[PDB]
């Protein structure tokens with residue numbers, strides 16, 4: 668459980684993110700794909716983009732970044748009461764997409780990296796610790812779900 672003050676820290680940076688969801692989403696996916704190229708394999712629609720320049724030019728890649736950040740944002744804004752949101756998310760990612768927990772760790776690092784880079788005034792040690800905690804809670808809950816659904820992780 669996060670404290671109210673830790674949630675405030677998360678939601679105050681998140682409100683910066685939402686001034687430009689598309690640019691943020693783009694940076695985060697590209698950071699992910701270049702830090703850990705193997706995750707690109709999970710996307711049959713992206714696995715075919717070869718350079719950062721190509722990633723930057725893809726409109727579907729940008730549209731997908733917005734889908735990810737909007738879904739994560741709706742979860743973060745529940746302040747821990749997110750079970751109804753996780754259920755459909757857990758099902759499609761365990762069954763259809765088959766995404767390992769380890770890759771959720773990856774994108775979590777990408778997210779933290781980009782917020783630190785684009786919002787240092789709002790992402791000091793305290794707020795980064797709060798975001799980490801909030802993301803660990805998300806990954807923990809989706810893992811418990813993965814197992815109920817029959818998926819290893």
Ligand code: HEM
Nearest residue numbers: 706709710712734735738739755756759764766770771774
């Ligand atoms: C922050 C964590 C993530 C969130 C909130 C998220 C959210 C979503 C959402 C909302 C969709 C569309 C609806 C659905 O399929 O359920 C989706 C599709 C998808 N996601 Fe995730 N995702 C996350 C992480 C990942 C990771 C780490 C991978 C793999 C490297 C991944 C791979 C995919 C794929 C392959 C699809 C289908 C691709 C397509 O649009 O054809 N996601 N995701």
Ligand SMILES: [Cl-]
Nearest residue numbers: 679682683686
């Ligand atoms: Cl504001």
Ligand SMILES: [Cl-]
Nearest residue numbers: 711712714715
């Ligand atoms: Cl192909």
Ligand SMILES: [Cl-]
Nearest residue numbers: 714715716717
């Ligand atoms: Cl090709």
Ligand SMILES: [Cl-]
Nearest residue numbers: 719720723724
């Ligand atoms: Cl460019």
Ligand SMILES: [Cl-]
Nearest residue numbers: 761762763764
């Ligand atoms: Cl299926």
